[PDB]
Amino acid sequence: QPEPDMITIFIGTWNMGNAPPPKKITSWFLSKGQGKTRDDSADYIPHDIYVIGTQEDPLSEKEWLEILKHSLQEITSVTFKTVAIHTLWNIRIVVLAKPEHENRISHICTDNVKTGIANTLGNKGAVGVSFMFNGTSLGFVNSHLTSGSEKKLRRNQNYMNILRFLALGDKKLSPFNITHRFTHLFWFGDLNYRVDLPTWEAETIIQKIKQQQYADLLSHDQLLTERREQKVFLHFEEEEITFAPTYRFERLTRDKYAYTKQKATGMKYNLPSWCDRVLWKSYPLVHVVCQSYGSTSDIMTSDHSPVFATFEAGVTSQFVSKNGPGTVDSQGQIEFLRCYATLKTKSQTKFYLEFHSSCLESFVKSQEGENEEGSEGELVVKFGETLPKLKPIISDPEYLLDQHILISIKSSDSDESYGEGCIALRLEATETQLPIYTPLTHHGELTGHFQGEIKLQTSQ
Numbered sequence: 049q050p051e052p053d054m055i056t057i058f059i060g061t062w063n064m065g066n067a068p069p070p071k072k073i074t075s076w077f078l079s080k081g082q083g084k085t086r087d088d089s090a091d092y093i094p095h096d097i098y099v100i101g102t103q104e105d106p107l108s109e110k111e112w113l114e115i116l117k118h119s120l121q122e123i124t125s126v127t128f129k130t131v132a133i134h135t136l137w138n139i140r141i142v143v144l145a146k147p148e149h150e151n152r153i154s155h156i157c158t159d160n161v162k163t164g165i166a167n168t169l170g171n172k173g174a175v176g177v178s179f180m181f182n183g184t185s186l187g188f189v190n191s192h193l194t195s196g197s198e199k200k201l202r203r204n205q206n207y208m209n210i211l212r213f214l215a216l217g218d219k220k221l222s223p224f225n226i227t228h229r230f231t232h233l234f235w236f237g238d239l240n241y242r243v244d245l246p247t248w249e250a251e252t253i254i255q256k257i258k259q260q261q262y263a264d265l266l267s268h269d270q271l272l273t274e275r276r277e278q279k280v281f282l283h284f285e286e287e288e289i290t291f292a293p294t295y296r297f298e299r300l301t302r303d304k305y306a307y308t309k310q311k312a313t314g315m316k317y318n319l320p321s322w323c324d325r326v327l328w329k330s331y332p333l334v335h336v337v338c339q340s341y342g343s344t345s346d347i348m349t350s351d352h353s354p355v356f357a358t359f360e361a362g363v364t365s366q367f368v369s370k371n372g373p374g375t376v377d378s379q380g381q382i383e384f385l386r387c388y389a390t391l392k393t394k395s396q397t398k399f400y401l402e403f404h405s406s407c408l409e410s411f412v413k414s415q416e417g418e419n420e421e422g423s424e425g426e427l428v429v430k431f432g433e434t435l436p437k438l439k440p441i442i443s444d445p446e447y448l449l450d451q452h453i454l455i456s457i458k459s460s461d462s463d464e465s466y467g468e469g470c471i472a473l474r475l476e477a478t479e480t481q482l483p484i485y486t487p488l489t490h491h492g493e494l495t496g497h498f499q500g501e502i503k504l505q506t507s508q
């Protein structure tokens with residue numbers, strides 16, 4: 049039975065509004081409703097992995113798992129296995145996988161982050177799951193961010209706290225946050241970003257939605273504008289939105305948006321918004337294709353509609369050679385040539401690099417670089433041809449060209465990372481000097497760049 053080189057992943061996000069679900073929720077898992085929807089001809093084909101994020105979820109874990117499994121079994125005639133379930137307050141993540149994937153799944157991790165301080169601490173935050181699928185690391189974050197149209201900056205802060213503090217994936221990747229630990233990272237939830245238009249324009253917005261004319265609304269969506277200004281979700285992707293705003297509906301119909309201020313809302317307006325979102329970030333040159341992104345039309349127990357997204361995701365096999373794992377394969381080498389980091393920092397410490405990758409027995413520390421001043425103010429750290437030659441565990445090009453090198457640039461004085469990035473080994477040529485590049489981030493914000501040349505030797 050061959051190992052797969054691609055799987056499909058379902059991501060769902062639903063703010064259930066503290067109400068139990070209706071008896072049938074299959075439309076969600078079938079990607080049917082509004083937006084980019086799934087072909088009817090695929091309805092019986094199971095996804096490999098289903099990841100369900102809920103917010104304002106009133107059910108017990110047991111109650112929701114029974115509904116989910118019975119839903120999938122009705123669609124696919126497959127009894128899915130539970131990979132993980134984790135709940136913080138009313139924020140929950142469930143990961144289910146086809147039983148044939150049991151032997152392929154390992155290193156299952158869960159964690160949560162509570163985002164608020166005092167007043168603000170006690171119901172917002174995030175849950176997450178990670179695991180390995182054969183040679184591929186997968187991370188999943190369900191976040192419920194701060195509500196209210198005038199709190200976009202709090203939402204951005206909530207995002208940075210979650211990616212700093214959520215402890216998923218390989219703890220040996222100590223310089224790296226979740227935005228660098230996974231081949232594929234999916235971040236979804238009730239992100240709570242709103243369409244920023246005047247209150248007086250509510251009925252105009254409703255009209256636009258009834259005409260399915262979303263362009264002048266999406267141009268005011270706070271998540272799209274904050275992303276375009278590099279204030280949040282730097283280096284993540286989102287499919288184009290082609291479904292109506294998923295909040296705030298009157299319950300038991302989808303015919304009415306309930307936007308007007310009420311005591312129950314804290315006297316805040318809830319103009320129709322795309323609160324409920326799915327974003328992803330995959331390592332460079334790994335296959336990831338969104339095959340659906342939309343909302344259901346027939347699940348009406350909440351003031352939100354469920355959102356679905358599905359993905360093709362490239363995966364790699366576990367590799368065993370005569371040599372690695374458990375020795376190097378001297379037929380393999382990675383040389384980083386004429387590299388330099390450009391940093392935005394005002395500090396004047398010396399810096400060194402660390403190279404981390406599951407193609408190495410353990411991470412590699414470089415010598416200190418040579419600091420120079422850039423023409424426009426910047427620190428430039430030069431490494432020359434001084435960098436340690438990296439010795440991968442397997443030299444077979446079918447393995448090595450699918451790997452990635454994580455890079456951290458660290459202060460000699462503090463051993464703190466000033467920037468993290470990732471380089472693909474999916475090169476146009478081996479035994480050939482080729483340009484490489486990554487942006488460098490720290491706490492998910494841009495802090496610099498790393499560029500230079502690579503020379504990769506494989507057994508071919």
Ligand SMILES: Cc1cccc(NC(=O)[C@@H]2CCCN2)n1
Binds near residue numbers: 152
């Ligand atoms: C589908 C599923 C759910 C939960 C766990 C797993 N698989 C594993 O944990 C494998 C079994 C042997 C060691 N690792 N698969």
